[PDB]
Amino acid sequence: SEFLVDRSKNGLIHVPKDLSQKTTILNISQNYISELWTSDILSLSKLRILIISHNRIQYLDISVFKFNQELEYLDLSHNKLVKISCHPTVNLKHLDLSFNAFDALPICKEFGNMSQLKFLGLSTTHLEKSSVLPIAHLNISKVLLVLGETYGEKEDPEGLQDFNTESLHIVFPTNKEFHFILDVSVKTVANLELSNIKCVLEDNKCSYFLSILAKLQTNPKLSNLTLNNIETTWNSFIRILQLVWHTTVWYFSISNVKLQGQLDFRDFDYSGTSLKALSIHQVVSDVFGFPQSYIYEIFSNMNIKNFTVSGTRMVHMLCPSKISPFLHLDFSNNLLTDTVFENCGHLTELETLILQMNQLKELSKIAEMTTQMKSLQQLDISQNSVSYDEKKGDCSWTKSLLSLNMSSNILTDTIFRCLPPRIKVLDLHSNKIKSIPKQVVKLEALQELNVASNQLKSVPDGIFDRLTSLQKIWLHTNPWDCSCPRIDYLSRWLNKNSQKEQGSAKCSGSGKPVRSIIC
Ligand SMILES: *[C@@H]1O[C@H](CO)[C@@H](O[C@@H]2O[C@H](CO)[C@@H](O)[C@H](O)[C@H]2NC(C)=O)[C@H](O)[C@H]1NC(C)=O
Ligand SMILES: *[C@@H]1O[C@H](CO)[C@@H](O[C@@H]2O[C@H](CO)[C@@H](O)[C@H](O)[C@H]2NC(C)=O)[C@H](O)[C@H]1NC(C)=O
Numbered sequence: 147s148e149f150l151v152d153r154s155k156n157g158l159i160h161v162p163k164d165l166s167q168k169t170t171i172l173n174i175s176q177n178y179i180s181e182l183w184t185s186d187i188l189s190l191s192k193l194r195i196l197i198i199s200h201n202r203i204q205y206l207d208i209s210v211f212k213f214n215q216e217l218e219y220l221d222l223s224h225n226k227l228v229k230i231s232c233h234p235t236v237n238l239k240h241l242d243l244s245f246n247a248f249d250a251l252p253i254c255k256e257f258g259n260m261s262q263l264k265f266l267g268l269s270t271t272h273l274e275k276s277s278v279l280p281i282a283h284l285n286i287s288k289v290l291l292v293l294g295e296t297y298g299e300k301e302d303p304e305g306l307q308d309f310n311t312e313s314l315h316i317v318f319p320t321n322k323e324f325h326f327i328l329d330v331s332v333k334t335v336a337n338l339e340l341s342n343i344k345c346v347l348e349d350n351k352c353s354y355f356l357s358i359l360a361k362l363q364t365n366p367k368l369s370n371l372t373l374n375n376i377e378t379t380w381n382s383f384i385r386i387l388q389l390v391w392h393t394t395v396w397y398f399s400i401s402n403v404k405l406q407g408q409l410d411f412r413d414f415d416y417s418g419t420s421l422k423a424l425s426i427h428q429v430v431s432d433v434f435g436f437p438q439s440y441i442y443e444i445f446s447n448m449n450i451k452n453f454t455v456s457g458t459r460m461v462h463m464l465c466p467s468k469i470s471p472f473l474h475l476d477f478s479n480n481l482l483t484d485t486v487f488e489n490c491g492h493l494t495e496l497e498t499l500i501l502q503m504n505q506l507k508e509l510s511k512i513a514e515m516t517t518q519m520k521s522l523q524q525l526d527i528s529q530n531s532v533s534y535d536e537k538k539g540d541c542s543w544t545k546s547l548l549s550l551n552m553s554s555n556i557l558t559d560t561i562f563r564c565l566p567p568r569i570k571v572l573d574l575h576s577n578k579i580k581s582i583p584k585q586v587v588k589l590e591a592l593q594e595l596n597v598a599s600n601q602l603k604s605v606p607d608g609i610f611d612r613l614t615s616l617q618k619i620w621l622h623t624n625p626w627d628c629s630c631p632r633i634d635y636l637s638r639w640l641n642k643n644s645q646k647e648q649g650s651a652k653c654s655g656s657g658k659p660v661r662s663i664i665c
């Protein structure tokens with residue numbers, strides 16, 4: 147049972163009154179409501195979730211839900227809250243006051259009795275360490291704190307030290323140089339996230355931001371660090387990578403970055419790291435574009451096992467200088483070409499490599515890249531423009547390759563002459579395959595084969611008599627000629643193996659499910 151009333155985006159001005167008393171979830175987000183009374187919601191006795199975000203409430207009396215004993219989730223984010231009255235009320239598990247106009251931290255003493263409070267979203271322009279005290283005894287899981295645009299004057303450096311939270315997401319002011327002296331190293335924080343870091347100036351390259359990051363080295367509890375919406379020079383960017391490299395963090399994630407200047411930094415110290423994974427999503431450079439020097443050398447020689455770089459104008463990734471510990475590399479959505487990692491015998495531990503959506507073109511070159519990757523189990527080169535030239539001869543795939551994703555390219559039926567021998571998973575959909583040659587019978591171990599969205603009209607008589615290992619197969623979005631007898635072996639054989647087909651391959655023009663032909 148769950149009576150959901152979704153009145154969001156209805157231009158409401160007050161809380162709808164003619165609501166069923168069965169309402170357990172009330173969504174009135176994105177409207178024009180300006181007041182929240184007790185009578186607005188007291189009659190909804192079973193109300194459990196209340197979402198009034200993106201309205202324009204300025205005053206919050208927290209006793210207005212005193213009669214909603216089942217309420218555990220309240221979202222009042224993106225309102226105009228400037229005032230909050232503290233009174234006895236119900237124990238919430240989730241309270242969101244983020245993105246409001248409070249001048250002081252909207253923390254009520256009554257918040258202390260919320261023994262199940264697991265998420266607290268706050269808004270403020272002034273943070274005093276002592277104002278957090280009522281909740282300093284609660285084991286909160288995540289706190290979102292949005293510092294208003296005018297935050298900055300009369301800063302308390304220990305303002306956060308009383309927060310007892312496992313995850314902290316600090317949202318710094320937007321459109322402002324980073325000059326804030328707030329210690330983000332908190333005793334109990336394991337997952338720290340910081341949004342909006344901007345330091346594009348000569349005076350001193352992100353010294354303030356780097357300073358608070360350096361205090362993240364002195365806490366073994368910090369395990370996950372995330373940085374969002376960063377704008378600074380290329381030097382300061384590499385300084386951040388280097389600084390956090392020596393912290394305690396295991397997982398470091400960076401998304402939405404705008405970098406400028408000429409990169410000078412290339413003397414990276416990889417020692418003393420605890421990093422398990424690093425991901426960099428969405429990097430934008432200045433008018434000159436992605437650096438032509440140093441950056442790849444920094445990226446290629448990282449002494450880590452998980453490494454993602456997506457959403458960048460990156461064009462190379464070189465063989466690591468020494469034997470590399472790279473284990474799972476995701477370089478999807480860049481501008482890399484086929485020579486990436488060429489002539490490389492230092493990636494013998496790599497097990498998965500994703501090069502989806504780049505600028506790969508010739509498959510023989512890509513298979514040569516794979517030869518010395520003796521542990522490589524999965525390879526994704528989908529959404530490129532890869533063709534295979536049968537003239538180049540045999541392909542030197544590594545024997546360890548089990549899964550191969552080549553969807554969204556311009557391969558032909560010759561592709562089946564350029565497949566690793568132990569192939570088990572094979573995704574070729576959105577290609578230019580017009581037929582299935584006799585080479586397929588040699589893939590006994592094949593378990594999955596996706597040739598959807600090609601130009602298949604039929605398959606040979608008996609092409610599956612020796613593919614005893616198959617479990618899943620896609621055939622849809624292909625123009626099959628369904629006149630008997632060209633469609634009979636495909637009809638009888640398909641009918642028997644009912645569970646194996648994924649989706650519904652349909653006849654060209656007739657539209658009938660192919661299983662339904664009686665030749
Ligand atoms: C390293 O990256 C790999 C993938 O590149 C991560 O593996 C997957 O994790 C998800 C978690 O939801 C699982 O569902 C998948 O089955 C995993 N795939 C494989 C092949 O293991 C892995 O977790 C990452 N490791 C670290 C330490 O971050
Ligand atoms: C290979 O990579 C492609 C992405 O390039 C995967 O494709 C998506 O697959 C799901 C169904 O499995 C669809 O909902 C999406 O529409 C596909 N995306 C595109 C752009 O076509 C594909 O699943 C991958 N194959 C394997 C075996 O992992």
Ligand SMILES: *[C@@H]1O[C@H](CO)[C@@H](O)[C@H](O)[C@H]1NC(C)=O
Pocket residue numbers: 152154155173175176197
């Ligand atoms: C409530 O509605 C808003 C706007 O349609 C939507 O973004 C949000 O995800 C919804 N949440 C729930 C729990 O219905």
